[PDB]
């Protein structure tokens, strides 16, 4: 029939916020499946508020030989600047060696007819992730 289970919640991870911009928004969500502990399902949420729509959005990453990285298909190279739906992008990591390392961003896109470039480094990860 139907049975849930015998005990407490859990505790899961807050999102992360690794870009902010007057009109751009950028955050981090980290999921762990039960199937795969040491997989690590990394999103990205790219929002435009501005009034310039964004386009050719290039989101990329690096991470250290230790672990691994996969670029999942996009959704779409175009962000709508009246609160529209964000970009989003699947990434796998493989953590098995039990290093608790850290994940490069790099942003590259156009903004109001300009070029807009940011690399940042995400250090203020959470210890849950591989806790």
Do not use: M
Not at 41 to 61: K, M, P, R, Y
């Amino acid at each position: 029939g139907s049975s849930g289970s015998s005990g407490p919640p859990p505790a899961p991870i807050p999102d992360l916020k690794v870009f902010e911009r007057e009109g751009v928004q950028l955050n981090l969500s980290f999921i762990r499946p039960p199937e795969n502990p040491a997989l690590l399902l990394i999103t990205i949420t790219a929002t435009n508020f501005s009034e310039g729509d964004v386009t050719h959005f290039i989101c990329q990453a690096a991470v250290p030989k230790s672990l691994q990285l996969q670029l999942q298909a996009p959704s779409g190279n175009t962000v709508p600047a009246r609160g529209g739906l964000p970009i989003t992008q699947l990434f796998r990591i493989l953590n098995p060696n039990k290093a608790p390392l850290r994940l490069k961003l790099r942003l590259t896109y156009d903004h109001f007819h300009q070029s807009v470039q940011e690399i940042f480094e995400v250090n203020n990860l959470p210890v849950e992730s591989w806790q």
